[model samples]
Target: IQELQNFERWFKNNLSYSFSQKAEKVVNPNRNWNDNTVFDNLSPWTSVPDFGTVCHTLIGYCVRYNNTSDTLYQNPELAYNLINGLRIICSKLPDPPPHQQAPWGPVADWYHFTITMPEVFMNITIVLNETQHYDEAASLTRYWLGLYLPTAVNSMGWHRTAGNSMRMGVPYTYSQMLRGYSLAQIRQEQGIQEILNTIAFPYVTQGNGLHVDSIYIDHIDVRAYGYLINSYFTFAYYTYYFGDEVINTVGLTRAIENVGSPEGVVVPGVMSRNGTLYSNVIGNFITYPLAVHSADYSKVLTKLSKTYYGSVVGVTNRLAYYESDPTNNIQAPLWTMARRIWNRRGRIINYNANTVSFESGIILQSLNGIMRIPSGTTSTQSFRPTIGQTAIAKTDTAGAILVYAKFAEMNNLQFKSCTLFYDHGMFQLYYNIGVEPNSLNNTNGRVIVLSRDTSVNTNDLSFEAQRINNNNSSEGTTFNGVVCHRVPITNINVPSLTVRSPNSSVELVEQIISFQTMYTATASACYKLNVEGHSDSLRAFRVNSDENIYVNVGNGVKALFNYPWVMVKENNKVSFMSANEDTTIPFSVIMNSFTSIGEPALQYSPSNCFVYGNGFKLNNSTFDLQFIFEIV
Candidate 1:
């Protein structure tokens, strides 16, 4: 029971939160409290301390002390003032608010308004259950819930793709769950069921929800941290609170296991052993309060030698961290780092149970919002069907993902048949198997970035970069304890080996790295190639066409850049299995035409297909001329 007096004493005293004092601080501090900036027709972003923000803080005070005797006990007027504040904020809510400005007649900011104000509005009704002003809170809470719940979150409802985000999807539906929590006992049971239908439901091919790969799909991708975090918190929140009440669960639990398992919490490479996650893991946004940006990440995790661990437990270690809780079976702030490499079960992508194996082994792990998330100047977007654009399938020895420059061509995307094959500890790569230069000059072709970093401080005198491959170890740039030497095979060269730093001039500075700025941070101290686009942003190689290149980074693991790539987040560490090879140029032993994305030929059966050559049955087609580049 959220019975006021009983919980109030335990809260501030137990948690040591200055609830009353904090409430006193902002509860009614003098400002234009009557202002309704949001509905008053102003952009929430442009307005100075918009009324929405003011309302959230004051309303938060009310939820914590609704009918309580802590502060209200002495200054009984605290409740009156708090109540009136709600009334003012409430009055501003349009009588028939789809109040949020919209392109959708009714598919408004249901998610926006619900969490922005209504979720808490309903909380007051529950807290003040039978108090003197109970009926009014009823009208306030009921009005909003009844209005938003029906259409904003149905299985096939319109998503606020233009204004709201994929993150808003769960909050929108969760509003229904909250509705169940505050309504009558009779209706509450169904609310529990509603939470079930929403949570347990497997996700989209068209709309948004969890993907088979366990990624929360927005644009077939979005910010994995943002999408996953929101969905996980909401699901786990009620998965615990209403466990008994919610009967039938979703169709998928592997999705859940792929996050928080019964075996405590294990994230392959996303989190450092000391507790903070790496930059590559978080992408670019700090979607929630507990979320941290590149600047504070290192500072927050380093506070007093006490590591905060993973993230999203109770939302109050200040909250960005999570290990688990003893209260129930599941852990809060579920982790995608908990996922095993490939989804197929026949051990297709075996990690030997090295659950977090991708941690050091991956670069930008979540391709989440890449296609749709805004970039330098273009706003690229794609559909799930176009994600049909290719396959992300790999065997124990190799992996391949095929993508194209099909949409919003302005971003300078490319036609890539990116493949990575492992052999004898060498990681070889290939790209542009059937790349067709477009008629558009700017989009005719693109550049590739071969970025490699040491564990830390690549700028020190000991740091290096050069072009040579030999039996002697002296040529490679030494970063930390390991050395990385580069060698490239050109369209037609000695094949001996050569690599050059792009020199608009070779000088170095603090390289602005996304991964270095994402989950982990150690100021960049490295020798970088200085060119036209060089600074912190361009820290690696910028090549024109495809070349078979190879190198051994601290891994003793060498990646030859003849033709492939890795979609990882962080740029710091290196870890991998076996060897890798890149067969990137188009396979033309026979005639082949290129129009749509070609069949990604995954050639993993050693030399059998090698000896057979053009005899293989992905045979040359007459009507459908195609490239059959096999991974040897």
Candidate 2:
């Protein structure tokens, strides 16, 4: 009789009631504060529905709950119950696994890659919102934004993975952009622009009249930023100037083209196919059930009518449906209905937090600063050095001596001759330098000149000197009077400078030195000072290499040097000059001129750029140079 009644009801409503009633019935009417079932359970991973399936179910369920305002369907308690299920599934994923292992969930026997954690969280947010549990939805969305969003964007941006792994997760930028779009939708509904600036700006291409793949799309770092721009602009127009009309005017048509199927069935182009299907089903469940005539029906119908005809087709295609032998198209339509609503509102809500502020309180502002580095300045322009050094002749006339030195490059290198010592060792070693393209910002090969006491000219020091320790494997604690060589000090100031010598107690102490003096055979020398020692042993050595000097040429070119060194035994008297402890390092210690290197030619994207970390204060400038030195 119950079966007959269901059939009769379905027959009367032409299956609308049959499919739609499922969303309504799942609402827990008996749920109350006394229920322990909500808090406790390790319900075995019975053949119960997975996150994807459950999310799809909830997507339709919540929409019906919101549309109908039904206590059972849209109750806050039920929403919490549904989200708790997702939390369980996500928590089961291991923290780390072998390369190419399942990401954060149970490994599906059928597929190799781990299930997407983001999708599950996204489902949680949608359910929370549907139940009008707005605060929870906002908080959960922030967790994803703060913890996972940036990393996910970067991984997808650079297609980076272990060898031959086909698991090219979504790019970080794409996720961020999508998240922003989601947030914006919610803000629009709530009539707030708090999340607007969180959207990144991207330049539209004149050729295609779309956001250029080359400028914004291909680069991993900036890729999402471009989409963010498009999403934000579209949102702005939709809210004020164009209202819903921008959906047609902006290249949102292209976005639609990128995402959905033709017949408005939620597929998975922009979002996962499973997510699309789930959201659609949930929307159908919630809206259709409560869709019975009410005074507010006119407004509900208006928004619903617009969504169904306008972008619903695109929303459907974004879902990534799972395949099985006994295909469940029976649940497909319901899924599609839920997902259609999810896509419409999901874009608006998920990204809403990004526009205002992350939990960290750091607002993502526009890249309003100049991208072009001025002719005589570093990428990070703290202080632009005067381009023309004091002419060699002028310095000699002002009681200042000018001296030039060049050392022969060594082909073979061995560190065995290099003595290993602990703490302050006064020793000298020769390391062979091989030029390689710069890894950061890809500059051409660099000339890694080493310092040596040579025959061509006594003052013709090979390179600046420093003291170094052989990675804490030596016996004696402190040595003094050691000679150390260094490359040109690109940026002037470094705090707490120290040097080490290998295998000897003779440690070269760092003291202020002037580089401006000139001499034919010898230059004026300053007093030798002792290297100061302190606790943080890691600070005992300094890298004199600076790759940021390479300028970015149009065809995508730069170079760097790979300097490999071996320990060699030698001792020499090194001089230091300091008229005042506060002055910059002497001019004589710096390289006469730095050689420009070449970088690889790759398409440029803003996402490929890296921003230096902040709070570093060094001589009114922060120095973050890229270099490689192995100390053993």
Deviation from native of the Cα of residue 44 in model 2, angstroms = 11
* Index of the highest-TM-score prediction: 1
Query: lDDT tens digits, residues 1-632, model 1?
Result: 34233332333232212222121123423333334442334334334335446545554555445434444432445445555756765655554545445212244334335444544554345445446665676666555556554433322234333213322333333344444433234234443344455555464433355443332334333312234433332333344334544422332333333222221232322232222233221221111221111101001100000111121110011112222222211111112112111111111121211122122111121221111222222343221211112222222322222222122222222222222222211121223211123322322111212222222234434223333233322233332222222223334211121222222222111112223222222111112111111112111222343432223233222222222222211122211111121222123411121111122342322221232433333232211111123233
For residues 1-632, could you state the per-residue lDDT of candidate 2 as single tens digits?
24323322323233223334222223322322213222223222332234334434444444443444455545666676656654554454333323343343453321212223443344345435434554465455444433433342222112232211111121222233334444233334311221222222233432212242121222221111123221221232223321353233233333323222223333221222122322222223222211111001000010122122111110101111111112111211111111112212222222111111110001011111001112222221111111101100000001110111111111110010111112221111112212111211322111111111122233322222312243322211222112222212224222122332211211222222122111111111111111223221111122345312221112211111112111111111111111111113222121211222221221121111122332111132111111111111
- How close to the true structure is residue 452 of candidate 2, measured as C-alpha lDDT? 16
What is residue 137's positional error in candidate 2, in angstroms? 5.8
> What TM-score should be assigned to candidate 2?
0.23
